Amino acid sequence: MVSRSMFDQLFKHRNSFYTYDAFIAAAKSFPSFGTTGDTDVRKREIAAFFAHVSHETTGGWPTAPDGPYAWGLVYIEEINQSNDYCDPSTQYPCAPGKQYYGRGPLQLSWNYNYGPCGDALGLDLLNNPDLVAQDPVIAFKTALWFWMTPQSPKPSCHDVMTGNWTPSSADLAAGRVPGFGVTTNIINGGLECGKGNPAQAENRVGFYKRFCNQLGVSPGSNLDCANMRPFG
Numbered sequence: 001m002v003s004r005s006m007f008d009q010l011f012k013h014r015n016s017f018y019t020y021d022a023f024i025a026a027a028k029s030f031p032s033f034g035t036t037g038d039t040d041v042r043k044r045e046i047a048a049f050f051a052h053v054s055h056e057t058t059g060g061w062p063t064a065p066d067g068p069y070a071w072g073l074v075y076i077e078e079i080n081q082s083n084d085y086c087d088p089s090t091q092y093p094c095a096p097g098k099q100y101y102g103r104g105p106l107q108l109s110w111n112y113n114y115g116p117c118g119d120a121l122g123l124d125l126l127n128n129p130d131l132v133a134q135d136p137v138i139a140f141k142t143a144l145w146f147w148m149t150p151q152s153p154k155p156s157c158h159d160v161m162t163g164n165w166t167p168s169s170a171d172l173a174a175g176r177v178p179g180f181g182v183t184t185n186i187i188n189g190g191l192e193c194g195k196g197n198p199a200q201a202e203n204r205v206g207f208y209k210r211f212c213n214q215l216g217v218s219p220g221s222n223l224d225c226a227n228m229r230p231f232g
Contacts, residue, residue: 001034014073017136026140030148036162043217045161048180049147051208053105069210077133078102085110095127103132104139106146117145154231157183174229179222180208193225201225
């Protein structure tokens with residue numbers, strides 16, 4: 001896994017809601033996370049997951065102590081909470097009086113994600129979405145659920161980083177070569193990769209390179225998703 005002192009180095013300025021013990025408890029729901037492959041592969045997977053988490057929750061500024069990548073895990077809830085984030089569904093019905101705005105380390109959003117995430121975790125997140133912003137174990141589990149779950153045609157980010165996803169010829173033709181860049185593409189490639197404004201993807205890479213440096217691992221190849229088409 002990762003030790004308490006290293007978690008406290010990566011996340012030196014975090015919101016104290018996000019405890020190390022909560023992260024460790026959540027990771028036990030997905031025992032292959034960070035335990036797959038040799039030491040370099042494990043370190044890159046952990047750095048990659050934390051880079052995305054940090055991008056989505058960062059409270060940094062350019063002159064912040066320890067630099068602009070040292071302020072991950074500051075945010076819990078989406079700040080703009082007026083829309084319900086509800087698309088009508090017979091499988092995952094929007095609960096009366098509830099909203100599905102972003103919550104937790106990967107900003108889980110929409111009834112159509114809270115539904116299946118809760119089903120997989122054995123939790124009624126569809127009818128109690130506020131659980132994600134109440135309980136840091138649940139919060140971390142929702143982020144790991146996303147990271148560990150394939151959604152065809154997309155592989156899991158876990159499988160990409162650990163060598164368990166081999167691209168098809170169409171993937172390769174589209175520039176989807178395994179590495180950090182493909183994880184950005186999976187998470188939000190329609191807006192952030194290809195010809196999207198690359199500011200946000202570049203920020204994710206900045207966090208990733210910082211965390212790789214702190215963990216003592218090379219970031220590897222194929223970091224940039226501007227050279228890459230979103231999955232169909």
